[PDB]
Amino acid sequence: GYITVGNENSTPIELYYEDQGSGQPVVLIHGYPLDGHSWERQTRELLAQGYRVITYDRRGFGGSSKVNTGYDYDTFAADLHTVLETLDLRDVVLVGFSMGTGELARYVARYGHERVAKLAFLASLEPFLVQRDDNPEGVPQEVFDGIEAAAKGDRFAWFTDFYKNFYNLDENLGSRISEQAVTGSWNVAIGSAPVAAYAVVPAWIEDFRSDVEAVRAAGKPTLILHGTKDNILPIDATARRFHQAVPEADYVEVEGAPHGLLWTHADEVNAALKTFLAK
Template sequence: MPYITTSDGVEIYYTEQGSGQPILLSHGWPLNSDAWALELKIFADAGYRAIAHDRRGHGRSSKTYTGNDMDHYAADLNDLVEALDLRDVVLVGHSTGGGEVVRYAARYGKDRVAKLITAGAIPPLMLKTDANPEGAPIEVFDAIRNGVLSDRSQYYRDLAHPFFGANREGSLVSAGQIDDFWRQGMQMNVAAAFDCIAAFSETDLTDDLKAIDVPVFLAHGDDDQIVPVDAASKKAITLLKNGTLKVYPGRPHGIYGEYQRELDRDILDFIAK
């Protein structure tokens, strides 16, 4: 299996398919690069070099006890881009991965990044503060921490339902989709899972969004129960120099089914513009 080693000695697993302009995909919590399995094929079939990695602590990457924060995630992504010498790269980030690619683009990507795409992404800030009253209170994230520490196996099964909107009437989410969410979550070590909660909820990415010059496409479901659109992408779009926001009616946080098919078409259209 292909790995790169980061500047602080962490092994990052990645997978790739196809050739052409690179598309680098960053997954959400508690998932890994398997979440992008379909996109790897679709984007490769469309003539691109599609690459996805497992964030540190996730999937097949090193089970890290330290460095599970947005600064390290972005630095790891930079190490991967440098190791593969990716240029004119399109970044795609879902949920926490959206924060990762935004911080990477702002800090490291000036001469590397062509475009940036996020879906259900966390920027600018998930936590409710005096300056961010639309955010969620700390108790919401403390409950996630408790779920990870008390019975993470059951917690991931339970979380998958609002994640994919399986708790909504008429949902077509399969049992297999729920099982795969659980499988990916259980591949992450507890320390990384716990620390990443602070990373995705308490990292303020306001200045990062302001610093990005390349075209950005923000995709977000208006029935996202994990990262509500009003506190995330609808605020992020006001901070970008060159941003486009598309809100998908009735779509959840998790990417699957017809939402996945529509989003993938939109991503390819945005890249081709």
Template sequence: MSTFTTKDGVEIYYKDWGTGPVVTFSHGWPLNADSWESQMYHLAANGFRCIAHDRRGHGRSSQPWDGNDMDHYADDLAQLLDHLDVKDATMFGFSTGGGEVARYIGRHGSKRVKKAGLISAVPPLMVRTEANPGGLPLAVFDGIRAGLLANRSQLFLDIPSGPFFGYNRPGAKPSPGVIQAWWMQGMMGGHKNTYDSIKAFSETDFTEDLKKFDVPTLLVHGDDDQIVPIDAAARASARLIPNNKLVVYEGAPHGIADTHKDRLNADLLAFARS
């Protein structure tokens, strides 16, 4: 396996497919790099070098007790790009991974970045506060934490069987394979790591990070996203990022990398080529 070790001793797994201009992929919670496989295959088959890592505590990376927060996630990504000496990358982040990309640019700048893409992404802030009245109540995230502690395996079946892919909508046709793949990736993650990450993706405020974006940015979001509602996410981010294009998938759920993969593959390839 391809791995490297961070400065604080965490072993990070990554995959590196294809040759050409670099595209990086940061995954969502509680998944791993495999969640991007359709997009990575498509772009690698069309002349790009595609790099994706398993976030610390997720997938095939090691499971540190501490450091399960956005600053460490962003620093791990920075160390991966340094390790591979990546230049002029197009960086895509899905959901929590969108927060990782935002915090990376906020902390490390865009010296290695040419473009960015936030896909169904959590920025600028998920949780409801006085300054963010459109966010979700803290009780929502407390409920996820309680479910994870009570029966993590069942929670990781319930989420993809329902709101993540929109399978709870009338007329939806759930795919057992998609649900099982989501469950498997979730269960590969560490118990403590995936628990801590709920706070990281829901309570981290990326407002100042987004204001530091100085590269062309693509925002893609479904307007029936029940996990990360579009108004407090992509539409709010579009008001903060100086040079962006917002693409709304009508009726689409959160998990568009699977449910709308052909459209997303085409959109990401076109953006990377532009």
């Protein structure tokens, strides 16, 4: 399916989406540089549990418009807003992974939570990833400069390097992810808009601390889950701070898990989601 969310010059900006099952709506928002199918190990369990599972592809990724403009969380949240309004979804469970955790917080901040039943943040960006004078716990900017340069330099070679650290392949290749599944991740990645390989990096490092305040103040059931061997979003720079800021949220650390834990630790992610959604 497609939902129109804007225009880029003479072209409509259309987001690809899937809408499956019956029951309470659950919207799953994927990470860079994948698409909605990256949720497949979660999707099939949620459908079996009697939820209506919707995924969509972020602008620039998967089946969505390969735009040059709007790679920022205000726009990403406006896109999500249009998806929810177009489908008139109510009592929705929003679940974000990696980039998708930014949509969740920015959406609540900008649009409120009238449509939202629950929030689940998996392998989160929050609260503010890049080190600044007022954000000493962040990661130094030079890391992101280097990522931007590599992704712009040759996105094809860059995605290979990214997935090594995404999945901790030195540890997990052949035990928790096959070579073929890694290849599938890379084939999806190179289908993204060339500019999206690097244009999203400034978005990853936006300050979400005010959005975290909105999330906490919404008082909706919230889950925060992260792997302890995450080499993309270090757990001390993200989830542990997020947990401190939103102490009311359910909090899960998946021992030994990398950033790409929807696949490598699907069982643990699924168990956490099942418990959380049942509440």
